[PDB]
């Protein structure tokens, strides 16, 4: 299951439309051995990139293109074996109309009928000024800029599950990416996972790593991955729900700048969520927020290849990012890593064994068939065993495969 992020922060800007543009990269995405691609927010939204949605059913006002174009793209992907997954932004919603009070707290789902046309009652009790006090309090975090949806309300629950099943049915999406899954509770999410039953669902729980007396992350980030492990757990360990492993992204960001000892934690196992529940963890080097033009938490650019060398050989489900693959000229090495990965049947739950994690050498063995070395350590020699040919190498990584 190697996922791809078919967009970045600037994609909505594209001359001629992102969906259309992306039609042209379908063959290449399919060839690379990519099983799923994460598409941006499809409906109408105040903020052009889509994370500020209003008329949930109006795909035609998307800056990425329209409903027609989306079903053409998703048809293409499906035509060449890959699954499309959608960015579900349901913690907050922007309203279409002012109620008399003068607050924009009256919604419009996009259709002549009443689906999704809620009002201030569906906004969380305390989200002033939007909320009129009559809804439930927020089950999770708040998003400053917009109305928060009260997911404890039953009409919100039914019509939102309706919209979800419509997106699988009419549009053809296969699974979900839950934006700001901290915005609402794991219990709420489970109702949406469970009742729309997607073939894949990854949630975005993003919180800070812990920092010691140096301005640098601790080595022990167990409080941080625990939070990811508990969401998957409360939501359903047997469900399709997984979460982006922000703990490996954080550690790795630093680790790669000559601190590869950070890559074996307090327990001699990988410090990320992949060291406690690789199965439910999907790894990434960067996404539209951490990187792209937001640069919220960038991976060292001159090292994004050691990032990929690590997430493509290691357990967890890897996620490649449009940019790195298509625009940074790394298409080929990324490809090659994906091939080593698929050739040896490495997957979700591959056994990982760390051999060395010193400042200048992280050397590890996946499933007994592949060994990945990250680092500038020249004299690696003696540590990689008999019967191992090198599969790929590049800037400060090399992977060997059992012959
Ligand atoms: Ca309506
Ligand atoms: Ca709010
Ligand atoms: Ca919320």
From Swiss-Prot:
Binds 3 Ca(2+) ions per subunit. Its EC number is 3.2.1.1. CDD domains: AmyAc_arch_bac_plant_AmyA. GO terms for molecular function: alpha-amylase activity; calcium ion binding. Ca(2+) 2 binds at residues 108, 111, 113, 117. Induction: Type B isozyme mRNA is undetectable in unstimulated cells and increases a hundred-fold after stimulation with gibberellic acid. Keywords: Calcium, Carbohydrate metabolism, Germination, Glycosidase, Hydrolase, Metal-binding, Signal. It catalyses: Endohydrolysis of (1->4)-alpha-D-glucosidic linkages in polysaccharides containing three or more (1->4)-alpha-linked D-glucose units. Its cofactor is Ca(2+). The record marks 289 as: Transition state stabilizer. Substrate binds at residues 51-52, 177-182, 206, 208, 226, 233, 269, 275-277, 288, 294, 373, 390-396, 400. The keyword Ligase does not apply. It comes from Hordeum vulgare (Barley). This is Alpha-amylase type B isozyme. GO terms for biological process: starch catabolic process. There are at least 4 types of alpha-amylase in barley. The keyword Coiled coil does not apply. Belongs to the glycosyl hydrolase 13 family. PANTHER family: ALPHA-AMYLASE (PTHR43447). Ca(2+) 1 binds at residues 91, 138, 141, 148, 183. The active site is at 179 (nucleophile), 204 (proton donor). Ca(2+) 3 binds at residues 127, 142-143, 146, 148. Monomer.
């Amino acid at each position: 299951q190697v996922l791809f992020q078919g967009f970045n922060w600037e994609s909505w800007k594209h001359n001629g439309g992102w969906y259309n543009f992306l039609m042209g990269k379908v063959d290449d995405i399919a060839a690379a051995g990519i099983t799923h691609v994460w598409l941006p927010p499809a409906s109408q939204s105040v903020a052009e990139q889509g994370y500020m949605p209003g008329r949930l059913y109006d795909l035609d006002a998307s800056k990425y293109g329209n409903k027609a174009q989306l079903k053409s793209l998703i048809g293409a992907l499906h035509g060449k074996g890959v699954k499309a997954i959608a960015d579900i932004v349901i913690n907050h919603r922007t309203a279409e109309h002012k109620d008399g009070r003068g607050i924009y707290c009256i919604f419009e789902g996009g259709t002549p009928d009443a689906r999704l046309d809620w009002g201030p009652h569906m906004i969380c009790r305390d989200d002033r000024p939007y909320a009129d006090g009559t809804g439930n309090p927020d089950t999770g975090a708040d998003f400053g800029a917009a109305p928060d949806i009260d997911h404890l309300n039953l009409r919100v629950q039914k019509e939102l599950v309706e919209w979800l099943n419509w997106l699988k049915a009419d549009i053809g999406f296969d699974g979900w990416r839950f934006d700001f899954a901290k915005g609402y509770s794991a219990d709420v999410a489970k109702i949406y996972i469970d009742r729309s039953e997607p073939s894949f669902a990854v949630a975005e729980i993003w919180t800070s790593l812990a920092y010691g007396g140096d301005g640098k992350p601790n080595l022990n980030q167990d409080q941080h991955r625990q939070e990811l492990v508990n969401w998957v757990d409360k939501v359903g360990g047997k469900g399709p729900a997984t979460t982006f492993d922000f703990t490996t992204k954080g550690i790795l960001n630093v680790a790669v700048e000559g601190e590869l000892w950070r890559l074996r934690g307090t327990d001699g196992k990988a410090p990320g969520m992949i060291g406690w529940w690789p199965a439910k963890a999907v790894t990434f080097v960067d996404n539209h927020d951490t990187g792209s033009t937001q640069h919220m938490w960038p991976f060292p650019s001159d090292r994004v290849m050691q990032g990929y060398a690590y997430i493509l050989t290691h357990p967890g489900t890897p996620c490649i990012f449009y940019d790195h693959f298509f625009d940074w000229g790394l298409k080929e090495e990324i490809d090659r890593l994906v091939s080593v990965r698929t050739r040896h049947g490495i997957h979700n739950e591959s056994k990982l064994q760390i051999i060395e994690a010193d400042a200048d050498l992280y050397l590890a063995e996946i499933d007994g068939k592949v060994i990945v070395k990250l680092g500038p350590r020249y004299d690696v020699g003696n540590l990689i065993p008999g019967g191992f040919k090198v599969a790929a190498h590049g800037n400060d990584y090399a992977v060997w495969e059992k012959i």
